[PDB]
Structures are given as structure tokens and as C-alpha cells.
């Protein structure tokens, strides 16, 4: 059943699993028409498919063309996500295919289950965790490849850069969830914290800056501070 705080260590065991977030698949700007009605214009989306153990991110870019002449787009977006995840699994060699897929939103369960009927041994699970994978489009390099796509494209990233050389998956996932929670709660503040010192750069093959172990502790502290403030404001407490 559902993935929660009780069974959190299971993310870092040696059973291949993938998180699927569909929250940036269907993206619109709402605007006024000449006649003063409202209309949406779609922009490029992405499926966020992450192995929490390895950091391997399968970023399937959703070009606005897939929505051309379709109806009920927020419904179609769930089934399109399930089609692409299904296609990714079948593209992987057998020994690489996941034994579990965890969807961040329960509305993905039936679409993904129906698309994965050919794979009865792959468990489709919800989670009770409120994971901040929606903020993936605040990572500059992920945002850049999505907006520039002129066609459907799959791009492979390691969202942990080289962190697993020095820390465990558990710590890398905690660091990632803290960065994404910060970026989601106050993007401008979070990005300032990450780039404020010009001497620490992002390697061409990386998403995040090349922080020393000590610099990461400072950064992680600055992110926890940002999140608590914003919470005090949100709630006046």
C-alpha cells in the first residue's frame, strides 16, 4: 500500500524503484482574450521520474504539440504520463526495470495501473509524503531544456550530481527534498542562498553548486531557516 514516514528507509534498499511526479506535465498561462473572455496557452511540460537510490532522473519533456486538438487536457495529462512511464519501463532492460513505482498524486494510480497491466509484478503505490518534486522546474538547467524543446524528448540527469561519492542515498534524498522544499516555498530566497558566493560554481555536467562538505551544512542550515520563516508568515505563528 501507501509509502509513509514508517517505511521511509525502503527508498534506499536494493529493490529498483521510481517516483513519478506528473505536476509539471500540463502547464498553462491563463490570459484575457480580445473579447475579454479567459483562455489558456500551454507551455512545455515534463514527467519527473526519479530513482531515489541512484539519483537517475528520466526527464520526459512534454511538448505543447501533444495537446493540439485534444479535450479534457488535465485528464489526458494523467494518461499521457502513464503512457510515457509505461514506454520508459519497456525501453529498460529487464534487470533495470523497477519492482515498484510510487506516484506522488493518487490520481495517477488508475492511469498507471491500466498502462502497466503487461507488468503484474510491478507494484504501483501512492505515498503519504508531501514531496516537493513540483519545484523541479526551479532547477535552472531542467527549466532550460524543457522550455527550449521543439519536439518530444527524453533527457537523463543525475539529480544528486556526484554527492553519492561522499554521502549515502538517504542523506542525498534528504538534501534534495530540503532544496526543493526551499525552492517551492520561496524560490527567489532559495536561489539567492545557492548562488550568493560567486566563487562556488555549477560544473557544466552538474545541476547544483560544487559545495564542500562544510559549505553544504551552512547551505542546508540557510534552507531550513528559509522554510521556518515562510511557515511563520504563512500561518501567523
Amino acid at each position: 500500500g501507501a509509502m509513509n514516514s514508517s517505511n521511509y528507509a525502503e527508498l534506499f534498499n536494493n529493490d529498483i524503484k521510481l517516483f513519478v511526479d506528473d505536476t509539471n506535465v500540463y502547464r498553462v498561462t491563463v490570459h484575457k482574450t480580445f473579447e475579454g473572455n479567459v483562455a489558456t496557452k500551454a507551455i512545455n511540460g515534463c514527467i519527473f521520474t526519479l530513482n531515489p537510490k541512484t539519483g537517475h532522473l528520466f526527464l520526459k519533456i512534454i511538448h505543447t504539440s501533444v495537446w493540439a486538438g485534444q479535450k479534457r487536457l488535465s485528464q489526458l495529462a494523467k494518461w499521457k504520463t502513464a503512457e510515457e512511464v509505461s514506454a520508459l519501463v519497456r525501453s529498460l532492460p529487464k534487470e533495470e526495470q523497477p519492482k515498484q513505482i510510487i506516484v506522488t498524486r493518487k490520481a495517477m494510480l488508475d492511469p498507471l495501473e491500466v498502462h502497466m497491466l503487461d507488468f503484474p509484478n510491478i507494484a504501483i503505490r501512492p505515498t503519504e509524503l508531501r514531496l516537493p518534486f513540483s519545484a523541479a522546474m526551479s532547477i535552472d538547467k531542467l527549466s532550460d531544456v524543457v522550455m527550449k524543446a521543439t519536439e518530444p524528448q527524453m533527457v537523463l540527469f543525475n539529480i544528486y550530481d556526484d554527492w553519492l561519492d561522499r554521502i549515502s542515498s538517504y542523506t542525498a534524498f534528504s538534501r534534495l527534498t530540503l532544496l526543493l522544499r526551499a525552492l517551492k516555498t520561496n524560490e527567489e530566497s532559495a536561489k539567492m542562498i545557492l548562488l550568493s558566493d560567486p566563487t562556488i560554481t555549477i560544473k557544466s555536467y552538474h545541476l547544483w553548486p560544487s559545495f564542500t562538505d562544510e559549505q553544504w551544512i551552512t547551505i542546508e542550515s540557510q534552507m531550513r531557516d528559509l522554510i521556518l520563516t515562510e511557515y511563520g508568515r504563512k500561518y501567523n505563528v
Binding site: L76, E83, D110, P111, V114, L117, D118
Partner: protein
């Protein structure tokens, strides 16, 4: 006008015949049921006064043989049996009738209730759902599980209803996942009607049989099958008009006949709310929607 004689009534028991029922006392000189209408299936059913658990009964059709009930003190139940000796049977029945030890099937002339509940139900179809080929009649009870319930354990004592599963490769064509999940017309029309049932009559007969097993025996798996077969039609955008008109009539008499006090366990809130208010056929079941709203508005 056919007769099911009883050898005796050694234990106190509530006897059902179709939608009617009668209390019989321990060793009461009760010798059976006469004036049973020819042309329909019938069910005779039992609930012991001492164990209000295990409702059980026999589906039969008097055109297929001479049937009687005898209590078995070893297995502890009223058993249906066939009498192959025609002249013995006519002679048994005529005696009990002369002595007036038989209750009359109490049908009002105006009353099409039982016809309306059994319109498409055939004994030959019942005998394929309830497999005991040495008998012309079929035993059902409260506890018998379905082939589908058994997959999720004695196959011989199972109800072999047609397996319906909305999240199955049978239900979903490769490449038509979203279309076939949201619009079950292909599953209803090609797989089930053309493929397995052959015609809407066989489909309706199974649906009506699942209802009556749910109602008369509190059979939980039968209740699941009745809802699944309603839901497959209501969730199909493309259903023949004659099928929708007949479904409305079928469900109307089922809802009309349901004891008022069993709507809490026999009716599935999700399926009924979906079928009457959200589904493709939300506007196609006028009679059923009117009786449901006037009799069970809490459920909706």
C-alpha cells in the same frame, strides 16, 4: 399448475417460494406447495428457526421433472430430489391435496412481479453458473463464493458467474488504455455481448440471477456480480437503445422488490450514485432513478 411435495417438516423453518414465505413448526403436518405457475424458474429456500445462519435453496423448473423436498437428519437440511416414477409422484401429490396439507403459491392475478424479476433467467444458464450435472435443480446458499472471489477455495461449490474486471487485459485493448477505461463500450459490446454472452438476453439473465441470489440468500459475491454487470452497462457510452430501456425495467422491479431494511448491505452507494448521476447512462434509467430517489434517498 405444478406441485413440490414435502415428505415431512421435522424441524421448525421459514420456507420461501419465490418472493413469498411461510413459517412451518417442528413436526407440523406440512406436505408442500401447489399451484406453482408453469413457464418460469422458481426458487424454494429455507432458514432454520434454530440457526438463522445459512439461508439455502433450490432453483428449479417443474417442466424439467417431478421434484420434492425431504429433510436429511444427517446433513441437517431440506434436500430437493427428483422422483423418476411419474405414477408414484402423481399419487403422492393427489393424496396430500385431498388432505389439504399443501400451501398454495399465492399469486395475485394482476401481479407480474416474479415474471419481471426472472424475465431472462433460464434453468439451462443457472446449471452452467451452479455446476452439479447429476441434478436438474440447483443448490445455492449464503456462503458459496464466486470463481472471481476464489481468485483473490473448493471449485465444486462455486458460483461460476462471468468474470468482470475493469482493470484487466480482457477489459483494455493495448493502445486504447484511456479510451477503454473511461468508455467500456468495447468491453460491453465486443468482449461480453458478442464474445461471451452472445446476446443481451443471456447477459440480463445472469444479472437477474445474481440479484435474486443476493436478495434471497444474502450471497455477497452474487451482489458484487449484479453491481459489476449494472456498472459495465452504465459506464459504456454506446449501448443499444433496447438494452437501456430493458435495463431500466429490470432494475425498477429489483429495487421495488428489495426489503426496505436490506438496502444498507445489498446496495453499493458508489455504483448507484455513479450509474444514476455521473455515468454516460445517467439520463437513460428514468424508472429506476425515480424509484431509487423515492425509496432510498439516504443512499444517494
Amino acid at each position: 399448475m405444478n406441485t413440490v411435495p414435502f415428505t415431512s417438516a421435522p424441524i421448525e423453518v421459514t420456507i420461501g417460494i419465490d418472493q413469498y414465505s411461510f413459517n412451518v413448526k417442528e413436526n407440523q403436518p406440512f406436505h408442500g406447495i401447489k399451484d406453482i405457475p408453469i413457464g418460469h424458474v422458481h426458487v424454494i429456500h429455507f432458514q432454520h428457526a434454530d440457526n438463522s445462519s445459512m439461508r439455502y435453496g433450490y432453483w428449479f423448473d417443474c417442466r424439467m421433472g417431478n421434484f420434492y423436498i425431504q429433510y436429511d437428519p444427517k446433513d441437517g437440511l431440506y434436500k430437493m430430489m427428483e422422483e423418476r416414477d411419474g405414477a408414484k409422484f402423481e399419487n403422492i401429490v393427489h393424496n396430500f391435496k385431498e388432505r389439504q396439507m399443501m400451501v398454495s403459491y399465492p399469486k395475485i392475478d394482476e401481479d407480474d412481479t416474479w415474471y419481471n424479476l426472472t424475465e431472462f433467467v433460464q434453468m439451462d444458464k443457472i446449471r452452467k453458473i451452479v455446476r452439479k450435472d447429476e441434478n436438474q435443480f440447483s443448490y445455492v446458499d449464503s456462503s458459496m463464493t464466486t470463481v472471481q472471489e476464489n481468485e483473490l477455495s473448493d471449485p465444486a461449490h462455486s458460483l461460476n458467474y462471468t468474470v468482470i474486471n475493469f482493470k484487466s487485459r480482457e477489459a483494455i485493448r493495448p493502445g486504447h488504455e484511456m479510451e477503454d477505461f473511461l468508455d467500456k463500450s468495447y468491453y460491453l459490446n465486443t468482449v461480453m455481448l458478442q464474445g461471451i454472452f452472445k446476446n443481451s438476453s443471456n447477459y440480463f439473465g445472469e444479472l437477474q440471477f445474481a440479484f435474486l441470489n443476493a436478495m434471497f440468500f444474502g450471497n455477497y459475491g452474487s451482489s458484487l456480480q449484479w453491481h459489476a454487470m449494472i456498472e459495465l452497462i452504465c459506464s459504456s457510452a454506446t449501448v443499444p437503445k433496447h438494452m437501456l430501456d430493458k435495463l431500466d425495467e429490470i432494475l425498477y422491479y429489483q429495487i421495488k422488490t428489495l426489503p426496505e431494511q436490506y438496502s444498507d448491505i445489498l446496495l453499493n452507494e458508489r455504483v448507484w450514485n455513479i450509474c444514476l448521476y455521473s455515468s454516460f447512462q445517467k439520463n437513460s434509467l428514468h424508472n429506476t432513478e425515480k424509484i431509487m430517489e423515492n425509496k432510498y434517498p439516504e443512499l444517494l
